[PDB]
Amino acid sequence: GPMRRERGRQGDSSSCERQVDRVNLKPCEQHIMQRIMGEQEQYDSYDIRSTRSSDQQQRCCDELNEMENTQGCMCEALQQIMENQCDRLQDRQMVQQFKRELMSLPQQCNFRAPQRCDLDVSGGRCS
Numbered sequence: 001g002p003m004r005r006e007r008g009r010q011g012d013s014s015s016c017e018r019q020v021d022r023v024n025l026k027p028c029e030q031h032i033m034q035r036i037m038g039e040q041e042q043y044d045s046y047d048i049r050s051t052r053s054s055d056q057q058q059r060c061c062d063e064l065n066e067m068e069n070t071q072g073c074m075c076e077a078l079q080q081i082m083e084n085q086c087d088r089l090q091d092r093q094m095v096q097q098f099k100r101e102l103m104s105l106p107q108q109c110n111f112r113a114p115q116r117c118d119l120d121v122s123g124g125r126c127s
Helices: 016-020 026-033 053-066 074-084 095-109
Strands: none
Touching: 016 074, 026 053, 026 074, 026 095, 053 095, 074 095
16 A cells, blocks of 8 residues: 555545634633632722623633533633633643632533543643
């Protein structure tokens, strides 16, 4: 079987991954990375009667709930966020707390459903 033969693989022109490019959740990752800041928050406290900018972040998950109509591909969505701004995660332990908060992000929407979401065959450097 010479290499001249066609690869024999077709149908890979499309993949849920392409749906990840539609993610673009800079405000969501900022709601998780900023929260773990600890020192970045706890300032300019506002009365509950007044609205808080953080309350606008919640809309994020709410959007992935019925806005972007995400699905089991959420993993590729959350993984994209970290990869969207994790190049500095190894710099500190932010990967920890961020992981705890990042674990709640997928809860505010309740994407849970599939027995397993992450695959051991594939993974990222940040984790």
